[PDB]
């Protein structure tokens with residue numbers, strides 16, 4: 366038993382809710398919150414910008430030190446950093462960004478990072494301002510992640526559509 370509330374059970378291991386991930390992180394304080402990162406860990410907009418703002422820019426400060434030491438991530442890759450005031454850890458995962466011209470096939474590799482954590486609060490990867498089909502992202506999530514994932518979807522009308530179209 367965990368502390369996530371009002372999530373709709375989609376599969377054995379995948380749950381979904383229409384909610385602001387920042388709020389959900391603030392309320393649950395999960396072991397792991399997933400950030401929709403880019404390879405530079407430049408948290409400007411979307412999930413990344415919203416989480417970083419909620420940390421008072423501490424996420425960005427930590428991230429800049431990470432990049433200065435290690436260089437950029439790979440598309441499809443991830444790193445574990447602090448969750449600051451939102452979670453114990455933040456798993457920064459780089460889904461392919463369609464609007465930047467990156468290969469959507471890399472979405473499965475991105476979701477594989479979730480399997481290294483038993484439970485996660487996460488966004489649907491590559492959706493929103495990343496430019497991919499969210500119905501597609503949810504399908505890849507369900508077909509790739511085997512650990513317990515609680516998906517917070519910001520957009521109400523997208524949420525209604527993801528549930529109604531889920532196979």
Ligand SMILES: O=C1COc2cc(C(=O)N[C@H]3c4cccc(O)c4C[C@H]3C(=O)O)ccc2N1
Nearest residue numbers: 401411412415488489491492493494518519520
């Ligand atoms: O306070 C605030 C205001 O800014 C926010 C923006 C988002 C957001 O852009 N979400 C979408 C997005 C964007 C880029 C990449 C992604 O994988 C996703 C998932 C998708 C969604 O879940 O709808 C979410 C929360 C907040 N919170």
